[PDB]
Nucleic acid binder design. Structure first.
Length: 54
RNA sequence: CUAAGAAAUUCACGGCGGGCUUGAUGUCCGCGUCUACCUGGUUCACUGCCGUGUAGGC
């Protein structure tokens, strides 16, 4: 549980978003660790075989 | 101010081997097609006393 310093080392994406009146924000996106991969793998190998043979 | 902004894939190859498709068959019967028309508004034609001489003759 430690961070360091906020940065975005020159190759991470960061994209202007138009504010309503005027102005922008830089909005650096970060890759999430949402695991739909577990829900994808368990619905393709675990009991996809049993439902598929039925 | 665009998940922004950048990017040489690069190369080669033996698909080969062989072969019985066979036989048989009933298309089979009919039939009312009628009726009336102007090719005519066109053949710039053989000559010749003729002038071949762009008008000139029956």
């Amino acid at each position: 549980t430690v961070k360091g310093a906020p940065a975005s080392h020159s190759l991470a994406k960061q994209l202007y978003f138009p504010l309503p009146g005027s102005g922008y924000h830089l909005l650096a996106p970060l890759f999430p660790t949402s695991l739909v991969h577990h829900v994808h793998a368990l619905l393709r190998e675990a009991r996809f075989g049993d439902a598929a043979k039925a």
